[PDB]
């Protein structure tokens, strides 16, 4: 419908700039006959999700890279795609106009944009708030009758999330998680270093705690929203650093283990709640398969464990065999989701890089190797960040895929957003991976999903300077010939009968 406005910051690509009045979006999808592909296309050079079509044809003139779609070769199925409504995002977000605002939600959560069905809300501040309160800041209140959503949840959060639905043609998926709770209830008394909770589980503290999480849901339910999960904190392995700067809270995998057995998982199934989703570690993959070995292993905290949530710092190296792999082959009936990813965390690199492809690049390799290891669904960090990668209370240190300017009411959508996008877009909830066999060592990511009514999508990601010339098979369909240019990505989908 409307093009990509471009703009240089001096880095590798160019940002879409997007105002009050205008901002770049799709046309209602639109799949072609059998023998037709449509492919959508991002190039550092510039280009941003370009559709074209072309043949699947009967004869094979490639004589390079093949890559065969094995549909009878079946994987996970996927959970979604989105990102966190932080006290930063929604700040940010909320300080556009009204015109501006809805111009940013459609680019993240309508059909027009790139089709987001996952939002992740912290309980409570987080290092992304201008502030440090927990919803029950009031001591000795074992009961929580003292329990209350602040402004930020009431008047930023909450309504963006309204919005956010209502943009949605998709069924949106709420995940909620917590950083710190309540001081009172902590071994060290403060919000942030190293502190776990009081006691031992089963104790009243641990008790609090589980009945804090009905509490959150309770509330947000009298708002008209319902959560499809919460995880069991927000890197529980932080809060037992010494000097852990952010809200933060402590456990041990045993310690996690026996708070989920004794005091979490009874806590939620007696509640009206019972049917929202646990998911456990929430952390960085390198604690795995470890931690699962730990909680998983022990039946009465097993049976209340729906799913692992991993973090990863794509700054940082950490191999997926060794990790989601091995988490797999040992607890193959508990999914595996990426609940937080990130970029720009290292000294040398400036938190907010606008127009970066290789950060548009470690999103996109990183979600081929979720996809390719495993993992139901990719959850980004803040939705929008101002152009320093705040406001954070602690210190600003990531990039974030929109770039609120407020002084201009003008939003940027980096590259990260478009990496994204090719995945998000076309990859709906139920979508499940499926075989797609390379015929001969290569330098490109690629990854085959079938949707749920049978088409097929393939993704394919070029992070070398080199064109590729590639064929695509589908066994039913035929032959696709194309060309993977030097840092690009592209989306292919397909009918299949
Ligand atoms: C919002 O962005 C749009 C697109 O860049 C701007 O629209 C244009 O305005 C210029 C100068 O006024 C015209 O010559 C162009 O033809 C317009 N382009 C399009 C594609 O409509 C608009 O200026 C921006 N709004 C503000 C207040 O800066
Ligand atoms: C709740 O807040 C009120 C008002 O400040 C305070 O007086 C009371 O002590 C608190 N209640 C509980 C149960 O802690």
Redesign the pocket.
């Known amino acids: 419908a409307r093009p990509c406005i471009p703009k240089s910051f001096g880095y590798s690509s160019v940002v879409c700039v997007c105002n009050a009045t205008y901002c770049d979006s799709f046309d209602p999808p639109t799949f072609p006959a059998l023998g037709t592909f449509s492919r959508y296309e991002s190039t550092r050079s510039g280009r941003r999700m370009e559709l074209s079509m072309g043949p699947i044809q009967a004869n094979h003139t490639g004589t390079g890279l093949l890559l065969t779609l094995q549909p009878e070769q079946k994987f996970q199925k996927v959970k979604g795609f989105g990102g966190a409504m932080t006290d930063a995002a929604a700040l940010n977000i909320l300080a556009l106009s009204p015109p501006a605002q809805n111009l940013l939600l459609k680019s993240y959560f309508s059909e027009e944009g790139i089709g987001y069905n996952i939002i992740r809300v912290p309980m409570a501040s987080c290092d992304f708030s201008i502030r440090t309160y927990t919803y029950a800041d009031?001591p000795?209140?074992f009961q929580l009758?003292?329990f209350s959503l602040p402004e930020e949840d009431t008047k930023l959060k909450i309504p963006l999330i309204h919005r956010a639905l209502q943009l949605a043609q998709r069924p949106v998926s709420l995940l909620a998680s917590p950083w710190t709770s309540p001081t009172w209830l902590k071994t060290n008394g403060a919000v942030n270093g190293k502190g776990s909770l009081k006691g031992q589980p089963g104790d009243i503290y641990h008790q609090t705690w589980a009945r804090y999480f009905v509490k959150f849901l309770d509330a947000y339910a009298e708002h008209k929203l319902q959560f499809w999960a919460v995880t069991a904190e927000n890197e529980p392995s932080a809060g037992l650093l010494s000097g852990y700067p952010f809200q933060c809270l402590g456990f041990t995998p045993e310690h996690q283990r026996d708070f989920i057995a004794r005091d979490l998982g009874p806590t939620l199934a007696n509640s009206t709640h019972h049917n929202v989703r646990l998911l456990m570690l929430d952390d960085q993959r390198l604690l795995l398969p470890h931690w699962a070995k730990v909680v998983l292993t022990d039946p009465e905290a097993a049976k209340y464990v729906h799913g692992i949530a991993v973090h990863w710092y794509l700054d940082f190296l950490a191999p997926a065999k060794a990790t989601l792999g091995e988490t797999h082959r040992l607890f193959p009936n508990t999914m595996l989701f990426a609940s937080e990813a990130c970029v720009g965390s290292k000294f040398w690199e400036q938190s907010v890089r606008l127009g970066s492809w290789d950060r548009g690049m470690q999103y996109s390799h990183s979600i081929i190797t979720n996809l390719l290891y495993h993992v139901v669904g990719w959850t980004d960090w803040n939705l929008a960040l101002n152009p320093e990668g705040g406001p954070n209370w602690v210190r600003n240190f990531v990039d974030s895929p929109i770039i609120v300017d407020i002084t201009k009411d003008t939003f940027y959508k980096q590259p990260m957003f478009y990496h994204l996008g090719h995945f998000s877009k076309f990859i709906p909830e139920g979508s499940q991976r499926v075989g797609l066999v390379a015929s001969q060592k290569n330098d490109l990511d690629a990854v085959a999903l079938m949707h749920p009514d049978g088409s097929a999508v393939v993704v394919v990601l070029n992070r070398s300077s080199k064109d590729v010339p590639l064929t695509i098979k589908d066994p039913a369909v035929g032959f696709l010939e194309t060309i993977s240019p030097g840092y690009s990505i592209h989306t292919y989908l397909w009918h299949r009968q």
Request: hydrophobic content about 0%.
């Open positions: 009031t000795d209140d009758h003292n």
